[PDB]
DNA sequence: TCTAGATCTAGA
DNA sequence: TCTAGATCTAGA
């Protein structure tokens with residue numbers, strides 16, 4: 145099992161067993177919500193189309209892929225004992241938000257992700273990263289995970305676009321895995337309309353003989369959205385207990 | 396999961 | 408010129 149080099153919300157590292165068994169085979173894997181890319185790092189497709197709405201994330205991935213050794217050496221400088229304090233963190237955060245250089249931003253982005261509070265990724269409406277200091281004892285520099293990512297990235301294209309645009313790139317030799325933001329159990333958030341729209345696009349792709357796999361919480365709403373797919377309940381219970389749902393659209 | 400402080404939006 | 412109610416900000 146390969147780990148992502150980024151802390152990221154909704155990481156599918158724990159559920160990789162259930163995903164890979166229910167994920168159809170193909171020449172290309174399309175991830176509209178790639179995030180940290182746990183599935184991409186733990187599968188073996190000939191090529192990938194990885195997309196996300198986060199421009200900083202996609203920019204980082206392009207840098208790591210194209211300028212690997214240069215990035216690792218630069219990013220390694222920031223993972224020293226002297227940088228693990230609030231005053232240094234907040235200046236680096238400010239440097240990140242004021243930087244117009246993709247490389248420097250990518251370098252700082254990794255630091256902020258590993259030194260920031262709970263590994264959060266949060267922006268204000270000005271597009272400024274505003275996650276406070278994390279106060280970790282010893283942040284880990286994912287050098288091994290970085291090189292493995294860049295190695296696998298050689299067969300992947302990265303795009304900063306919404307799910308509708310990325311799924312439109314899917315061909316007949318493609319498989320689509322969708323990991324959208326979690327549906328609510330009970331602004332800027334991923335809306336219920338978008339949750340329903342995702343299933344609708346999934347219905348269109350399978351009608352075009354393109355396999356689509358979707359993962360989400362197991363709720364009454366998700367069962368309604370994915371009612372045209374074979375439903376597979378994963379028990380990772382985690383005051384109520386929440387199961388996960390794998391919705392497969394097989395042609 | 397929170398919340399004090401600042402800002403937004405409408406009532407013509 | 409208010410400001411209730413709802414967002415937004417960011418951990419200071």
Ligand SMILES: Nc1ncnc2c1ncn2[C@@H]1O[C@H](C[C@@H](N)CC[C@H](N)C(=O)O)[C@@H](O)[C@H]1O
Pocket residue numbers: 152153154155156157176177178179180181182183195196197198305306307308323324325334
């Ligand atoms: N409309 C959108 N279109 C495409 N991606 C989005 C959209 N909204 C949110 N996202 C991204 O979808 C991702 C959701 C993550 N939970 C995915 C995690 C990913 N599966 C991983 O293993 O790391 C986030 O990175 C979002 O930035």
